Amino acid sequence: AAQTNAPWGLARISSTSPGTSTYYYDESAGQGSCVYVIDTGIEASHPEFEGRAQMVKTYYYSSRDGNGHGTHCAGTVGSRTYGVAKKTQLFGVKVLDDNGSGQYSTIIAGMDFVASDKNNRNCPKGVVASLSLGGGYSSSVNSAAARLQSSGVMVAVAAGNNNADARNYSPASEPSVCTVGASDRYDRRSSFSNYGSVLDIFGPGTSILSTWIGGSTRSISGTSMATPHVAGLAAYLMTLGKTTAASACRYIADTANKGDLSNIPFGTVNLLAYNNYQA
Ligand SMILES: [Ca+2]
């Protein structure tokens, strides 16, 4: 399949070169997979989700995304126009309030929720979780992310936007999950992107167009935007039978565009998520 005039990040993920604008992907498009977006929620009524999104959990007075950030991330995972895996099922878990904040205890509860909740969902091709959030180092937060991964979920987490070594942030610093840095349309490390040994992969993170609340669309930047590209990619690859939850991060790294990013600090992987789709 070919989507012309796609957001640059989608085009990037199916290309051996920067500077193109068509997204190429296998028509299966993540059908039969599921992606949990653990964030401020998802506006499920957005036409871009085509009925494939639903809220499954909140820790607040409402499951509504009153912020937009969760809706944007969900859009990059799986919206019809702005998404990597255009036929995946999206499940929203609202661990962040409408200000985009959340106590670590609530975030941890949300991760353990997903590990159980997948047993209540139909995801024959596999399960992914996208965590576009984080804070300072916490062994408890890392351990929760590790449990989620261990339970059979491909966990993708944001590296963070501190232009610093991600070893000092959680869940970014958890070794067993897939930690995602951000790049721009010119294959530069995004200026805010964290880096370091704990990073596993980079994805498009600067100036990313996706869904927003009120049935709208929006371009924003962050490792929060890179993460759902990788989560959607994992779901897409799992539907193709190319990988599994336990090995998707490794597979994505194995098959990534290598050595093509600029301003990657010595000791950080120079790997850019790539679907290796040959039309
Ligand atoms: Ca790893």
Swiss-Prot record:
Q: Which reaction does it catalyse?
A: Hydrolysis of keratin, and of other proteins with subtilisin-like specificity. Hydrolyzes peptide amides
The chain's disulfide connectivity reads 34-123, 178-249
GO terms for MF: metal ion binding; serine-type endopeptidase activity
Q: What is its EC number?
A: 3.4.21.64
Q: Where is the active site?
A: 39, 69, 224
Cite a GO CC annotation: extracellular region
Domain Peptidase S8 span(s) in chain numbering:
7-279
Which of this chain's residues are annotated to bind Ca(2+) 2?
Answer: 16, 260
What is its EC class?
hydrolase
State what protein this is by name: Proteinase K
The shown residues of the full protein are 106 to 384 of 384
